[PDB]
Amino acid sequence: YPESIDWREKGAVTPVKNQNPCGSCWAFSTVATIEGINKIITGQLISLSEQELLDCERRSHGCDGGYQTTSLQYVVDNGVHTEREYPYEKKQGRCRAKDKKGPKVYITGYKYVPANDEISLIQAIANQPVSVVTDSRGRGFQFYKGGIYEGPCGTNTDHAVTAVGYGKTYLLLKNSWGPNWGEKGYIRIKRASGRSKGTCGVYTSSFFPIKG
Numbered sequence: 013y014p015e016s017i018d019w020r021e022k023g024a025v026t027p028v029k030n031q032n033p034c035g036s037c038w039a040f041s042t043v044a045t046i047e048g049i050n051k052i053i054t055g056q057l058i059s060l061s062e063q064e065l066l067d068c069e070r071r072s073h074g075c076d077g078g079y080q081t082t083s084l085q086y087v088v089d090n091g092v093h094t095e096r097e098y099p100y101e102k103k104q105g106r107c108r109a110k111d112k113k114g115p116k117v118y119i120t121g122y123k124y125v126p127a128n129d130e131i132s133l134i135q136a137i138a139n140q141p142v143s144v145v146t147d148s149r150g151r152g153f154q155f156y157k158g159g160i161y162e163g164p165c166g167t168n169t170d171h172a173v174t175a176v177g178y179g180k181t182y183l184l185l186k187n188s189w190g191p192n193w194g195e196k197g198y199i200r201i202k203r204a205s206g207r208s209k210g211t212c213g214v215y216t217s218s219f220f221p222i223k224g
């Protein structure tokens with residue numbers, strides 16, 4: 013793997029979005045990975061629809077939270093519309109996926125990253141943006157301003173985010189709380205060495221889409 017990577021710089025990352033006040037991070041996390049792998053494979057960077065997952069992927073619990081596996085599987089089974097055609101409404105509504113006839117993006121599957129292991133995660137991000145989770149309950153995280161975040165934070169993960177890169181000592185994370193949070197929407201989180209739940213539990217549960 014390269015010493016560092018920034019998928020933003022490689023053009024595989026769309027502008028930061030704002031999920032609030034709907035607790036639909038699961039959808040934002042998944043969509044960002046889809047946006048990323050689509051660019052890597054097809055050369056196209058297009059903002060895709062969190063609202064479709066929200067309205068249509070109902071194994072997850074809408075604004076009350078959801079799952080990486082079910083949301084990734086949704087895109088395998090059904091593909092996903094652009095954000096432009098299916099915009100965010102900040103709340104679950106009727107699944108209108110069938111009513112929309114515009115451009116869609118499909119994936120063919122997804123892979124789970126072996127958990128609690130630095131290099132397994134780093135190796136995955138080297139290839140594509142990855143869906144990851146963090147413990148976001150704390151003042152330090154919620155009011156993060158900038159720099160490499162080393163703590164304080166627990167490992168009781170409750171928020172799904174997107175790993176869009178790393179450096180020697182950190183993982184670059186796209187958050188979904190708008191561009192006014194952290195570093196223009198992003199947080200750089202310390203790389204815990206080796207076997208570890210990771211800083212803020214960032215090694216806990218990681219998945220990435222496959223577009224073959």
Ligand SMILES: *[C@@H](C(=O)O)[C@H](O)C(=O)N[C@@H](CC(C)C)C(=O)NCCCCNC(N)=[NH2+]
Pocket residue numbers: 034035036037038073076077078079080145146169170171172217
């Ligand atoms: C996170 C957010 O929008 O801030 C959102 O609550 C969420 O989807 N969180 C996930 C985090 C996991 C580590 C992937 C989550 O909690 N998913 C499980 C189901 C949601 C909670 N359960 C119920 N009963 N709603």
